Design a protein around this ligand. Structure first.
Ligand SMILES: O=S(=O)(c1ccccc1)N(Cc1ccccc1)[C@H]1CNC[C@@H]1N(Cc1ccccc1)S(=O)(=O)c1ccccc1
Ligand SMILES: [Cl-]
Ligand SMILES: [Cl-]
Ligand SMILES: [Cl-]
Lengths: 99, 99
C-alpha cells in the first residue's frame, strides 16, 4: 500500500493471537506495545522521549503480522500511551519513506 | 527520494538560514525542534510523548527546507530528544509510507 500522512498511519496487527491497532512510526527505533503477555524470556529496558522514560519488557524473536505481512523481531511491552511499530519491524515488511 | 529504515531516517533541514539534522517521524503529529530562536509571536501547545505531556512553544507559518524541499508551516520548539519533522510538514513535501 501507499499510506498517506494526512492522518496517523494506523494499521491492524496480529500478535500473540490478538488483533491490535498500531502506529507505523519511522522515528521509533523499536516496536512498543501496551501491556500484554508474550511467550519466552524477557529482560528489562528503558525507553524515553518527550515527557521522560518508561520501563518495558523486551521479548526477542516474536512473530507478528502487519497488514498481511509476516515478520519476526523484538517487541517491547509496557505502559506506552500508543501501540508503535518501529523501524526494527518496518524494515522487515519493506516499508520506505517516499517523496 | 526513497528512504529505507535500517538506520534512523535523518536528513538535513534549513531554518533561519542554518543547517540542522532532523529525524523524519511518521509517529509525530507535529514538527518539534530543539531550543532555537524563531521570529514572531508564539502560542502554547501541549504535546504527548512516550512519558507524558509537556508544554512547548508554537510558531506558525515558518519557512523551513527539508531535504531541499520548501515548506512553510507550524514549528514547535521544546526539549525534544532530537529535531523531529512530523506529519504536518511531511505532508507538505509529499511524503508517504510504502510497502
Ligand atoms: O519524543 S517523542 O515521544 C515525540 C516527539 C515529537 C512529537 C511527539 C512525540 N518521540 C520522538 C523520539 C523519541 C526518542 C528517540 C527518537 C525520537 C516519539 C515519536 N515517534 C517516535 C517516538 N515514540 C513513539 C511515539 C510516542 C508518543 C506519541 C506517538 C509516538 S517513543 O514511544 O518515544 C519510542 C522511543 C524509543 C523507542 C520506541 C518508541
Ligand atoms: Cl529486532
Ligand atoms: Cl531494503
Ligand atoms: Cl503546519
Amino acid at each position: 500500500p501507499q499510506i498517506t500522512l494526512w492522518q496517523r498511519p494506523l494499521v491492524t496487527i496480529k500478535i500473540g493471537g490478538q488483533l491490535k491497532e498500531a502506529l507505523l512510526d519511522t522515528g521509533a527505533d523499536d516496536t512498543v506495545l501496551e501491556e500484554m503477555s508474550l511467550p519466552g524470556r524477557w529482560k528489562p529496558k528503558m525507553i524515553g522521549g518527550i515527557g521522560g522514560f518508561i520501563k518495558v519488557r523486551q521479548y526477542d524473536q516474536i512473530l507478528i503480522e502487519i497488514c498481511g505481512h509476516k515478520a519476526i523481531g523484538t517487541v517491547l511491552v509496557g505502559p506506552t500511551p500508543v501501540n508503535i511499530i518501529g523501524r526494527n519491524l518496518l524494515t522487515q515488511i519493506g516499508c520506505t519513506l517516499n517523496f
